[PDB]
Amino acid sequence: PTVCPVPLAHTPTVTKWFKGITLHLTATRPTLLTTRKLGLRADATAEWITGT
Amino acid sequence: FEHATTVPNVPGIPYKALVERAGYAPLNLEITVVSSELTPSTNKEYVTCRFHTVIPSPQVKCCGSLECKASSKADYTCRVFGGVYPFMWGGAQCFCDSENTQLSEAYVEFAPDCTIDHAVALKVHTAALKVGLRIVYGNTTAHLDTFVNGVTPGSSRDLKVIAGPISAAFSPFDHKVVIRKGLVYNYDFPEYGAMKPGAFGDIQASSLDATDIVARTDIRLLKPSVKNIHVPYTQAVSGYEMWKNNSGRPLQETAPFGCKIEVEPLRASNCAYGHIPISIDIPDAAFVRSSESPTILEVSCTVADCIYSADFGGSLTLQYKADREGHCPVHSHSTTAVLKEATTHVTAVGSITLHFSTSSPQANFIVSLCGKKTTCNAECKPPADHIIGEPHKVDQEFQAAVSKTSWNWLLALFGGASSLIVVGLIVLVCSSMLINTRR
Amino acid sequence: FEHATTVPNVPGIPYKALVERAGYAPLNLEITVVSSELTPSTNKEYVTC
């Protein structure tokens, strides 16, 4: 084992709205986005995103 | 003195309470769950990884016969073939064109790189929740790690506390768990000995170095057709790789209640759920009798602009008249409002400005200053923002969650019907009585 | 903190408002239209003399 360098994606732009957010995301290469709620139901979602 | 309360298991959110001993002056008590650790008890059933299908060099009984022995290797497979007459490099290996049998032998072992890239299969049992608590009373703060079961007491050198049980037990881990390079998955792996080829746990062992490896990889040997010596075989793909491709996201990205999964040992830290009943024996030494504490004479509340949000978006002022200079404790006596400051310097006569956060549309709550209670009446507007990076510090109830305008309209609309049916009953009774009297 | 106002478009006359965040003291906001130019979309058709 050792330490490998990995890239950091462009920081997303978050736009708020009543009980909701909109992440404008830019990633030249497939970047993983994983979201989950903090309640009884995780409602976990995972997606590999490309482009903008 | 012993006091009982119910602290909400949400890390980082202080919970404030007032202990009002009759003889003594009231005292503050703020409790924070600095960290929690929901850890189960686990036993390792086996480890699995890529198998190395090792093939021993074939043997030929040159002009005789061979019989398949019974070894105890992992997924051992031995077959015997008839006359082969094999070639290696010199154009011949034997002297009998027939009755020249060959023994094809094959089995599996652990791959050399399995010491890092291997998965461990575990079963979980009832999990015990441990909490680190920072608790402050008056002047004294105390850090203590305790078990939330209602029996095991935590202690800090004068302070005894018992915590729990949790109102509703919960475990993010299913019965069967798999750990791979720190990642945790809830996979219903096959039991030890129930190997199935082409799926997870097709090769199993108690440890990487254990020699009693058992596997079922569906390896089968075929008749050698080519003239040159070689042992053919076909085998199902490694089920470890199949699960690795179709593993899915780990439990670090799927556990609910914001539960941070961790390994070595398996645990779930900073997990926010439920309420912890805590009974605490606060020592009487820290308590200060009312005869020496400044008991304020006359205090009133004037509330500035307020808003119901997670952040401290409310302000108010307490105009007080007291008899001495001291360190009076201020508190809120409602479940839908929490102050920022705990102990405030009180003078002979003056004012103190304080902050508060509420969940109700209307601030209709009693504030207490050195025991003296005053009802603050306000009207908090909806928050301007939509999202915050901070948790809501107070639960939203049903009773104190609707404005007094809505309450007045609803009560008027319902009391109209109630008074109308009452008036109808009264009218019927009066008519009957008038009929009876004038009959 | 986003504050929305309707400033009258009158150069040289300041418009004053008070922003009142709930948990924080009010602040003063003076907006003055120092200059304002309205420029149309233009394209020369021709010249003459």
From Swiss-Prot, chain A:
Location(s) in or outside the cell: Virion membrane; Host cell membrane
Post-translational modification: Palmitoylated via thioester bonds. These palmitoylations may induce disruption of the C-terminus transmembrane. This would result in the reorientation of E2 C-terminus from lumenal to cytoplasmic side. N-glycosylated.
Annotated membrane topology: Single-pass type I membrane protein
Function: Plays an essential role in viral attachment to target host cell, by binding to the cell receptor PCDH10. Some specific strains may also bind host receptors VLDLR and LRP8/APOER2. Synthesized as a pE2 precursor which is processed by furin at the cell membrane just before virion budding, giving rise to E2-E1 heterodimer. The pE2-E1 heterodimer is stable, whereas E2-E1 is unstable and dissociate at low pH. pE2 is processed at the last step, presumably to avoid E1 fusion activation before its final export to cell surface.
Oligomer status and interactors: Interacts with spike glycoprotein E1. Processing of the precursor of protein E3/E2 into E2 and E3 results in a heterodimer of the spike glycoproteins E2 and E1. Spike at virion surface are constituted of a trimer of E2-E1 heterodimers. Interacts with 6K protein. The E2-E1 heterodimer interacts with host PCDH10 (via domain Cadherin 1); this interaction mediates viral entry to the host cell.
Protein name: Spike glycoprotein E2
Organism the protein comes from: Western equine encephalitis virus
Interval of the full protein contained in this chain: 582 to 633 of 1236
